[PDB]
Write an enzyme that holds these catalytic residues in place. Structure first.
Site, PDB file in Angstrom:
ATOM      1  N   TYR A   1       0.599  -1.145   0.029  1.00 41.29           N
ATOM      2  CA  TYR A   1      -0.042   0.064  -0.058  1.00 41.29           C
ATOM      3  C   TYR A   1       0.792   1.345   0.025  1.00 41.29           C
ATOM      4  O   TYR A   1       0.126   2.171  -0.432  1.00 41.29           O
ATOM      5  CB  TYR A   1      -1.080  -0.147   1.016  1.00 41.29           C
ATOM      6  CG  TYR A   1      -1.804  -1.273   1.066  1.00 41.29           C
ATOM      7  CD1 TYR A   1      -2.851  -1.328  -0.018  1.00 41.29           C
ATOM      8  CD2 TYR A   1      -1.613  -2.556   1.641  1.00 41.29           C
ATOM      9  CE1 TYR A   1      -3.715  -2.358  -0.111  1.00 41.29           C
ATOM     10  CE2 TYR A   1      -2.406  -3.482   1.444  1.00 41.29           C
ATOM     11  CZ  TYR A   1      -3.351  -3.520   0.724  1.00 41.29           C
ATOM     12  OH  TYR A   1      -4.279  -4.648   0.243  1.00 41.29           O
TER      13      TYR A   1
HETATM   14  C1  LIG Z   1       1.111   6.097   3.327  1.00 42.83           C
HETATM   15  C2  LIG Z   1       1.292   7.378   2.149  1.00 42.83           C
HETATM   16  O1  LIG Z   1       2.144   6.589   0.870  1.00 42.83           O
HETATM   17  P1  LIG Z   1       3.792   7.049   0.905  1.00 42.83           P
HETATM   18  O2  LIG Z   1       4.222   6.189   2.293  1.00 42.83           O
HETATM   19  O3  LIG Z   1       3.746   8.359   1.156  1.00 42.83           O
HETATM   20  O4  LIG Z   1       4.282   6.516  -0.332  1.00 42.83           O
HETATM   21  C3  LIG Z   1       0.072   7.704   1.664  1.00 42.83           C
HETATM   22  N1  LIG Z   1      -0.731   6.414   1.049  1.00 42.83           N
HETATM   23  C4  LIG Z   1      -1.624   5.709   2.037  1.00 42.83           C
HETATM   24  O5  LIG Z   1      -2.253   6.444   3.048  1.00 42.83           O
HETATM   25  C5  LIG Z   1      -2.583   4.798   1.510  1.00 42.83           C
HETATM   26  C6  LIG Z   1      -4.040   4.535   2.017  1.00 42.83           C
HETATM   27  C7  LIG Z   1      -4.618   3.547   1.342  1.00 42.83           C
HETATM   28  C8  LIG Z   1      -3.926   2.015   1.503  1.00 42.83           C
HETATM   29  C9  LIG Z   1      -4.338   1.580   2.967  1.00 42.83           C
HETATM   30  C10 LIG Z   1      -5.547   0.996   3.159  1.00 42.83           C
HETATM   31  S1  LIG Z   1      -6.001   0.436   4.679  1.00 42.83           S
HETATM   32  C11 LIG Z   1      -0.083   8.928   0.536  1.00 42.83           C
HETATM   33  O6  LIG Z   1      -0.300   8.396  -0.664  1.00 42.83           O
HETATM   34  O7  LIG Z   1       0.209   9.919   1.035  1.00 42.83           O
HETATM   35  O1  LIG Z   2      -2.158  -8.374   4.780  1.00 40.75           O
HETATM   36  S1  LIG Z   2      -2.508  -6.934   5.116  1.00 40.75           S
HETATM   37  O2  LIG Z   2      -3.075  -6.768   6.580  1.00 40.75           O
HETATM   38  O3  LIG Z   2      -1.144  -6.203   5.117  1.00 40.75           O
HETATM   39  C1  LIG Z   2      -3.501  -6.198   3.813  1.00 40.75           C
HETATM   40  C2  LIG Z   2      -4.914  -6.618   3.922  1.00 40.75           C
HETATM   41  S2  LIG Z   2      -5.586  -6.178   2.399  1.00 40.75           S
HETATM   42 XE   LIG Z   3      -7.136  -2.655   2.040  1.00 39.39          XE
END
Ligand SMILES: C[C@@H](OP(=O)(O)O)[C@H](NC(=O)CCCCCCS)C(=O)O
Ligand SMILES: O=S(=O)(O)CCS
Ligand SMILES: [Xe]
Ligand SMILES: C[C@H](O)CO[C@@H](C)CO[C@H](C)CO
Ligand SMILES: O=S(=O)(O)CCS
Ligand SMILES: [Cl-]
Ligand SMILES: [Cl-]
Ligand SMILES: [Cl-]
Ligand SMILES: [K+]
Ligand SMILES: [K+]
Ligand SMILES: [K+]
Ligand SMILES: [K+]
Ligand SMILES: [K+]
Ligand SMILES: [K+]
Ligand SMILES: [K+]
Ligand SMILES: [K+]
Ligand SMILES: [K+]
Ligand SMILES: [K+]
Ligand SMILES: [Mg+2]
Ligand code: NA
Ligand code: NA
Ligand code: NA
Ligand code: NA
Ligand code: NA
Ligand SMILES: [Xe]
Ligand SMILES: [Xe]
Ligand SMILES: [Xe]
Ligand SMILES: [Xe]
Ligand SMILES: [Xe]
Ligand SMILES: [Xe]
Ligand SMILES: [Xe]
Ligand SMILES: [Xe]
Ligand SMILES: [Xe]
Lengths: 466, 265, 591, 593, 52
Positions: free
Chosen positions: A390
């Site tokens: 993510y």
């Molecule tokens: C963490 C951060 O990403 P970076 O670590 O800055 O690349 C941030 N993304 C997120 O918060 C992704 C949120 C969605 C994924 C998690 C779902 S539980 C953002 O795009 O600014």
């Molecule tokens: O397996 S993780 O908890 O990191 C992501 C769930 S979609």
């Molecule tokens: Xe997620």
């Protein structure tokens, strides 16, 4: 009112540096060394003359693989540049130039210092490093405090460099944008001097998560590189920067001031040797042994006591001093990371230790962990965003300003600095990869590289004021 | 040295939790695995194959002068500079002898130099390869591993919450774990890769054995964490896990309002 | 009287049993016998379409046989879903711009997971587009400048001509200039402008085609509250083309209306081209007297106004219109039903913040994380748990909704009972445990049901949401598992931050949002808080929770999405029966 | 010594673009007004009026109503001119079928287009052009491969790279690989989403599945392929295009995040990495920050944007994403020699339309017009074409040399600018029909400035000097006509007469790296696109394959792109004919309609 | 510091209950931290927000 309670400051070797220091004397609002640290970050920049010279020479300006191409062999490309090939092709050179910046680093340094200087005895410094490839610059407090911003060393150095190079080599009008690009990079199309050759330890002034977060937008890799991996000095630098940041955020105020000052003293400055003592006792064990040592030390010091014994025999503990209990959990937290990630000599598990040292503490005592939820909260977010698709990255790229790790009130980033300091080279985005120049250049500043002794000596100088 | 109590243990379930997490309690060995089968199941390295390294031996990397570092002996994996490898296990919601958070608490109390993540469907453990191998002997051969309810699976982990199969086995989309002649056997490794010969794990524990050793509360067997009438009742009238939960909430809420508010509470 | 997930109130459908054709109380299932993706109509059709696509473009795409280690997806049942509570609806049968009138009380069952994926569901996408393409402004200052600087009188007649002109130029035309390009009306038929006012005499004097009628849209007690806040003022609600925000962002709306409203003022009042007063119109629209759905975001997640990330939870609460429906006004045996408001408001609350924003802005991919969020508005699960807490509290405290004293102790009592009931059913029904196979689904559902019950019963939104976080130990200490890796960041920390006042910790739930640091990253939370805020306001007799202008601004039958019945609308999109706005059919070759 | 004007006679079709607007000699200063029936003379506005009446009846709110035009004067009191796309009759290549339309027959004109057909709001080609730019994510894969080999311990080979790309092409738009019970997207909605790679290593290129390769040797002429491959070197770069429908529900900043998720998953699945292994975070970090190339950089608070908004795209990146530089027309159109003018006039078309209509209009201001007539004037009726070529022919004869060979002196720039300004003014003065066609002063002012810059840029190969010639046109234009353009047109022209060779903090910056966030350019139409064309042409004239970023140039050499970046004027015309099928439509999941 | 000092001193001076914490914070900070600015708050500087 002054934080008059006395603490002893111990070094990383477990020996006392200064005794009977009032807690007030290590706070960022009073301590001259902590204040000088912030002043150094604000006023210092590095000029990469080698980088500037190479960008002008080859046309690889800025970042992202950018290249302004000059073609010296137009007559060998197999193309006609004149209708019907009437005239043979002739090459031109319009985006590049060769300037001996590195060879003239000494004269350039003298010219830059004179341009930056406000008054002769003002403290402006310009040092030639890496055999002329980099200049370390520290502007005067006079120039730095002219207005209200912290970016004056960055802005003035980029312009003084551009102006002095144009004048020294009496360059023609065509050179103006190119020499500006050599120092500023993509500015002003970008707010940052992106891909430029004037660097600050601070991030661009557009990047804060909130007001007062500038001192928190510093990656753990930078801290580790500047302290050359000396574990507790990295913890002290990170904790001190987080302490300054929390003052600027407005959180070292009123009924929360003592709580915030103790996080800095206990976790960041080895106050009463708690961090060292816990690591010494549990070093040959696991995270759990640090939990046992932390609870035992809190009881020994009268910070907690048995509140009630349930029918099963399980005891609920009470905090006789809630802010000190929180600070003892923060000290145990960095000790736990040193023991766990220290045994593996691999930083990745730091996020797991952040979460479970706190979770084990609550299950063990019935008292809240560090930050009443933030310690486990960041253990969760930080674990997730260092082992999933993510976002995030390896431990060293986080900071007090990163959305993933900003929440904890100053006790999370220092444990990342400890873990990354103990890492044996298990990451690809480690300190050498992201912070090489930072460590080689800013790491030469004694106060940044070894803040513990400097803070203790400055605290002893003003200990009688409180 | 202060003697840990680990967590409130007022009943069979929480006492099972305490046994799992207390490092001074020996987890009884219930099966034997040959070194070849054990390494084949992990799937990172085979018997006799040299350990891969991520960095040179610790003695050659020039560690800096650092007094605190001298207080923490490196593990054998760290000294050799082994790759950090991950092993993943999943515990069914149906009466397992170990569950997810108990794994994190146990790992942090019994093993040195770990990284570990807890998810609802799996639990990871990541350590220097040779260290991970030693830890896996406890995870795979002792009473905390019922072959039908605690399985190894590196990915495509769904099954913890799925209904049990006709043989009482937990679902595995890749079918790494199967029931053959009454025994649970791994017909593929933890990565779903082929194995020369299946790894026999023996018989699963009987239902009454599972109910006796489980660490989870379950309302269907008449043992929920919160019983009917417990909500709002005095602490003395509810389970100690609920008295502990209420206390943590009260102290996190009051402490985060003003720290001094929880003094003496 | 069985649980709603075993028997819907009126249609008597067994939502869990329908997934398997087996008693959901039995802990037994056969796996690896469904033919993998062959059991799914949408994935089977997708596979055949993918083969044609690969042949046409020369690059492979969807290929289920790539599933890890020869295990195609579908080794277990790929469950279908039923939209919660559609059989309990009796109003909202009017035709909408997106579909013919729904027959209230008709269920939507058998939907596949891919039908409720934000990427494949135009109702979910239109829901967000209708929020971000909206621009709201007070017109007092523009009228003041015309009267004081320009010297012309503002009357109902000039306001009507101004709105006729604004409706001509907001999407399609020009009024003042010669030889000017214009947009094809077919591409912007969803763009228009209206106004509302607390002055009934002014409302009755305007062309009703340009009016959001507060008296018509709301019940008397709610109309009285909203009109008292609006007062003797006129507010404009303009919706720019959905196609336009799809070529840029929601921050375009205030700028776009700044241009067109300025021009309609110039043309309706005969102001010379280039007069200094012109700049007061655009300044008023963009900055002087404006209401945004979303505020700007900082550099890491940089956004101008009107991105989903800048929308405060209370604004997501108030744009929902379930609060003014007969189901929410007399559904609880002739009494107000705050639970209907919570469960509906959390549906776009969850789908927009998690699928529309966290997924479609901050992360992404082909799944839309759909099954995570589908669980909160299908099969009556969260519905049963929520109503359980309300019935429990009404009987225990002998009072109605919004009347349980808002003490920390009462919050803990209700939370413990709802957590207990949630765990009781997941434990006693293996088929339900398998349906909500992800721990996050089960953890978020007990936390949301607890917060819904506390919020509906006390009318306190911060206390209602405090009950959500208290579910962390209640859930963890029972199952010894919670949700996905990073699910409890906010739950752990908000057990302490809810009543903290530190710099970035303290803030009322109404004004928290996806930029409150604790909430900026993870799914399965924000929507629940949104529902709780809406329900707590509903329970204590209020017409909205945070902004009366937002509540009135979305009471509009010309909106492409029906903000009164979102669960139903998402189901209609699941049936491929929702026609969104923004499509470019008018200017593209046949298909 | 000058040929017949292209706006009076197209080179091959011999069409008189200005005369066709009136059916009268454009040299005659006489016209009858108020005799066209107002909007009745326009097919599109007449059809729009009838559609509006139906729309009003269905929704209960009035909309388009031409009778609302001020003081009873319907629009159309003068001729509402039609337009002809410049130079389509001089094209001879690019006849391949594209994802948006069957193969264009090269050399076929597009004439009689109405102004509304070239309005960004009504033209899906223009919208798709922008969407293709912002849905693109570019990354070096070296670090991800390094982490797999050093940290995970697995070998990276052509075979594992091929499986990785097959998996990434499966999950970038539609499917799942690792998990059970996972939702997926309808392949019909994302058929425009896919991923490819390119490399300077010919042996590696030949070892990969060609379906996932951007082939530098096939797309570019030898001399340009040599230059690009020398910069790329022995490295692999990934070019991934996320669904057009996805950016339409959010922004271009989604692309790096989206590819961060899917590329991470394809690495996990192609290399059998455990779910939750610490190495996973290095893949997403590499894609989003560690080794990434963005089309656009972030913007500050007032105009806040994450990466990949049109506002953050540097002028040089708009120059390099154009692919006219590698077409036969640009390589042998000038009597067998390179034609930098063809490159300038094509690169400035999306340069102008995307920055002015896509960005200044569709992000910073807005409304129903798309400011279309302002920008239509720069790529229609061969007017700017004639002026640009005039300057080139004049300089080639005066300096007796080819393109890119006139010394780049300030004195030489002034001479060419004076002659192009003179020629531009001569034609606007001698042809009342031309003066009426480009009725807005900004059109006429931008056109003489752009033609001057195109001539200087093409003749000297210097992009900053080429653009300096643009600003010098301000006194040349103003002192002749005593009028310039719209109220705030010359903010940047006045100031850049001084800022071009200034080095003050926010004044100095090479034209390649300027963009819509350079303060002087942040607000006004009719400029940036011209600079973009000049930058591309100056690089082309001096023998270069690109002007600013070789990775951007290679990244857009792809026949699977929805928009044809080689022939943008033609593509915009095809959209004007309603013959361009864009990506991102939701037909697959919406009622029959 | 002024916003936090005002919030803390008002909570202490009137010995307010836990429910008041978010509301008193809102009275001084406005929409912060959902907004970077202390938007609609009651602590004003002559300078703009440091993000602007
Ligand atoms: C963490 C951060 O990403 P970076 O670590 O800055 O690349 C941030 N993304 C997120 O918060 C992704 C949120 C969605 C994924 C998690 C779902 S539980 C953002 O795009 O600014
Ligand atoms: O397996 S993780 O908890 O990191 C992501 C769930 S979609
Ligand atoms: Xe997620
Ligand atoms: C931690 C302790 O049990 C909290 O006590 C509450 C039940 C009552 O709080 C009082 C003050
Ligand atoms: O008349 S102005 O020059 O202000 C605007 C022209 S579109
Ligand atoms: Cl910078
Ligand atoms: Cl930068
Ligand atoms: Cl502010
Ligand atoms: K050099
Ligand atoms: K030069
Ligand atoms: K000086
Ligand atoms: K920096
Ligand atoms: K205290
Ligand atoms: K009891
Ligand atoms: K198989
Ligand atoms: K109406
Ligand atoms: K008339
Ligand atoms: K201010
Ligand atoms: Mg269609
Ligand atoms: Na064996
Ligand atoms: Na109370
Ligand atoms: Na190919
Ligand atoms: Na070729
Ligand atoms: Na010169
Ligand atoms: Xe640092
Ligand atoms: Xe201390
Ligand atoms: Xe196992
Ligand atoms: Xe029990
Ligand atoms: Xe907890
Ligand atoms: Xe929810
Ligand atoms: Xe304009
Ligand atoms: Xe001038
Ligand atoms: Xe132009």
């Amino acid at each position: 009112a002054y934080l008059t309670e006395k603490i002893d400051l111990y070094g990383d070797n477990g020996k006392v540096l200064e005794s009977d220091i009032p807690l007030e004397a290590v706070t960022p609002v009073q301590n001259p060394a902590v204040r000088e640290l912030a002043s150094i970050f604000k006023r210092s920049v590095a000029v990469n003359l080698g980088g500037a010279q190479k960008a002008l020479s080859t046309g690889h300006y800025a970042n992202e693989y950018i290249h302004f191409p000059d073609i010296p062999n137009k007559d060998k490309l197999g193309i006609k540049s004149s209708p019907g090939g009437k005239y043979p092709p002739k090459s031109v050179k319009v985006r590049t130039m060769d300037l001996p910046l590195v060879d003239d680093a000494d004269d350039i340094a003298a010219r830059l210092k004179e341009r930056l200087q406000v008054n002769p005895d003002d403290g402006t410094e310009v040092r030639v490093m890496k055999k002329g490839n980099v200049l370390y610059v520290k502007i005067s407090e006079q120039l730095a405090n002219t207005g209200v911003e912290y970016t004056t060393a960055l802005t003035t150095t980029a312009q003084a460099m551009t102006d002095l190079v144009m004048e020294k080599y009496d360059l023609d009008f065509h050179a103006s944008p190119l020499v500006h690009c050599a120092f500023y990079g993509r500015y002003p199309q970008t707010y940052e001097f992106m891909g430029g050759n004037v660097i600050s330890l601070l991030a661009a002034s557009c990047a804060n998560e909130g007001p007062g977060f500038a001192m928190r937008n510093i990656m753990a890799n930078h801290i580790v590189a500047a302290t050359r991996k000396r574990t507790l000095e990295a913890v002290a630098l990170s904790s001190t920067l987080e302490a300054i940041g929390h003052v600027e955020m407005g959180d070292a105020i009123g009924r929360w001031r003592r709580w915030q000052a103790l996080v800095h003293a206990c976790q960041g400055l080895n106050a009463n040797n708690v961090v060292y003592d816990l690591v010494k006792e549990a070093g040959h064990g696991c995270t759990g042994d640090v939990v046992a040592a932390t609870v035992g030390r809190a009881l020994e010091d009268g910070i907690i006591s048995v509140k009630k014994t349930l029918p099963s025999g399980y005891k609920f503990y009470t905090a006789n001093d809630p802010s000190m209990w929180n600070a003892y959990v923060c000290a145990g937290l960095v000790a736990a990371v040193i023991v766990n990630q220290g045994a593996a000599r691999a930083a990745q598990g730091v996020s797991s230790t952040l979460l479970y040292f706190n979770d084990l503490i609550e299950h063990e005592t019935g008292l809240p962990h560090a930050g009443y939820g933030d310690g486990m909260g960041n253990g969760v977010s930080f674990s997730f965003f260092s082992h999933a698709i993510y976002g995030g990255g390896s431990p060293g790229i986080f900071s007090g300003n990163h959305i993933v790790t900003r929440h904890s009130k100053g006790f999370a980033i220092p444990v990342i600095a400890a873990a990354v300091s103990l890492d044996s080279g298990t990451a690809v985005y480690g300190p050498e990869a992201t912070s090489g120049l930072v460590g080689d250049i800013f790491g030469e500043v004694d106060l940044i590289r070894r803040p513990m002794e400097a803070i203790a000596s400055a605290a002893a100088e003003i200990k009688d004021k409180f | 040295v202060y003697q840990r109590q680990f967590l409130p243990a007022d009943d069979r379930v929480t006492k099972n939790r305490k046994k799992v997490v207390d490092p001074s309690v020996k987890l009884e060995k219930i099966r034997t695995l040959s070194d070849k089968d054990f390494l084949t199941l992990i799937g990172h390295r085979h018997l006799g194959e040299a350990y891969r390294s991520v960095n040179p031996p610790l003695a050659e990397i020039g560690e800096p002068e650092d007094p605190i570092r001298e207080l923490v002996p490196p593990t054998e994996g760290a000294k050799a500079g082994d790759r950090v490898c991950t092993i993943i296990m999943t515990d069914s919601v149906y009466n397992p002898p170990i569950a997810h958070y108990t794994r994190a608490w146990m790992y942090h109390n019994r093993f040195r130099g770990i990284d570990n993540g807890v998810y609802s469907g799996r639990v990871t453990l990541e350590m220097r390869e040779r260290d991970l191998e030693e830890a896996c002997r406890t995870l795979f051969e002792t009473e905390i591993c019922d072959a039908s309810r605690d399985q190894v699976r590196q990915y495509t982990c769904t099954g913890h919450s799925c209904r049990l199969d006709p043989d009482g086995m937990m679902f595995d989309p890749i079918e790494r774990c199967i029931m053959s002649g009454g025994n649970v056997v791994y017909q593929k490794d933890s990565f779903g890769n082929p194995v020369d010969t299946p790894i026999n794990m023996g018989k699963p524990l009987s239902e009454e054995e599972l109910i006796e050793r489980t660490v989870v509360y379950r309302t269907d067997r008449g043992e929920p964490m919160t019983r009917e009438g417990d909500p709002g009742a005095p602490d003395e009238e509810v389970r100690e896990a609920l008295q502990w939960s209420r206390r943590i909430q009260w102290l996190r809420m009051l402490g985060n309002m003003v720290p001094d508010k929880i003094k003496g509470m | 009287p069985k649980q709603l997930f075993l028997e819907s109130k009126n249609s008597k459908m067994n939502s869990i049993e329908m997934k398997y054709g087996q008693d959901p109380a039995i802990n037994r299932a056969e796996f690896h016998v469904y033919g993998g993706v062959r059991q799914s109509k949408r994935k089977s059709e997708a596979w055949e379409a993918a083969k044609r696509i690969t042949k046409e473009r020369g690059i492979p795409n969807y290929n289920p046989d790539l599933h890890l280690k020869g295990a195609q997806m579908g080794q277990k049942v790929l469950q279908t879903y039923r939209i919660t509570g559609l059989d309990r609806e009796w109003a909202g049968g009017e035709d909408t711009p997106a579909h013919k009138g729904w027959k209230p009380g008709t269920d939507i069952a058998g939907l596949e997971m891919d039908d409720l994926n934000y990427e494949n569901n135009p109702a979910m996408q239109q829901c967000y587009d209708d929020m971000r393409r909206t621009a709201i402004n007070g017109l007092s200052i523009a009228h003041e400048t015309i009267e004081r600087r320009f010297g012309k009188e503002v009357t109902p007649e000039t306001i009507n001509l101004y709105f006729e002109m604004l409706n001509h130029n907001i999407g399609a035309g020009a009024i003042m200039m010669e030889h000017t390009a214009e947009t094809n009306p077919e591409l912007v038929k969803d763009s228009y402008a209206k106004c509302f006012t607390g002055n009934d005499e002014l409302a009755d004097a305007l062309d009703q085609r340009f009016l959001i009628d507060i008296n018509k849209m709301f019940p008397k007690y709610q109309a009285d509250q909203i009109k008292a806040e609006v007062g003797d003022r006129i507010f404009q609600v303009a919706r720019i083309p959905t196609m336009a925000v799809r070529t840029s962002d929601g921050g375009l709306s205030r700028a776009w209306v700044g241009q067109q409203a300025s021009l309609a003022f110039l043309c309706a009042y005969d102001i010379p081209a280039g007069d200094a007063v012109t700049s007061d119109f655009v300044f008023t629209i963009k900055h002087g007297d404006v209401v945004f759905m979303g505020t700007q975001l900082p550099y890491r997640r940089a956004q101008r106004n009107n991105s989903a990330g800048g929308i405060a939870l209370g604004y997501y609460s108030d744009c929902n219109q379930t609060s003014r429906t007969p189901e929410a006004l007399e559904g609880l045996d002739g009494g107000i039903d705050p639970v209907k408001v919570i469960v509906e408001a959390l549906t776009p609350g969850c789908v927009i913040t998690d699928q529309g924003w966290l997924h479609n802005y901050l992360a992404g991919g082909s799944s839309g994380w759909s099954n995570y969020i589908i669980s909160v508005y299908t099969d009556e699960v969260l519905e049963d748990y929520g109503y359980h807490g309300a019935i429990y509290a009404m009987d225990k405290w002998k009072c109605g909704v919004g009347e349980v004293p808002n003490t920390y102790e009462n919050m803990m009592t209700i939370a413990e009972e709802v957590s207990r009931w949630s765990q009781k059913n997941y434990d006693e029904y293996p088929g339900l445990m398998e349906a909500h196979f992800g721990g996050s689904q089960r953890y978020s559902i007990q936390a949301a049901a607890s917060g819904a019950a506390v919020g509906a019963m006390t009318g306190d939104p911060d206390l209602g949401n405090a009950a959500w976080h208290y579910n962390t130990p209640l859930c963890k200490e029972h199952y010894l598992r919670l949700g996905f890796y990073g699910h409890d960041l906010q739950d752990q920390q908000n057990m302490g931050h809810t009543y903290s006042y530190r710099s970035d910790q303290g803030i009322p739930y109404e004004l928290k949002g996806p930029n409150y640091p604790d909430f900026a990253m993870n799914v399965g939370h924000m929507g629940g808080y949104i529902g709780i805020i809406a329900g707590a306001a509903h329970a204590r007799g209020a017409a909205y929770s945070t902004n009366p202008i937002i509540k009135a601004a979305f009471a509009d039958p010309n909106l492409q999405f029906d903000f009164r019945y979102p669960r139903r609308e998402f189901g209609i999109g699941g049936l491929r029966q929702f026609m969104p706005a923004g499509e470019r059919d008018a200017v593209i070759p046949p298909h």
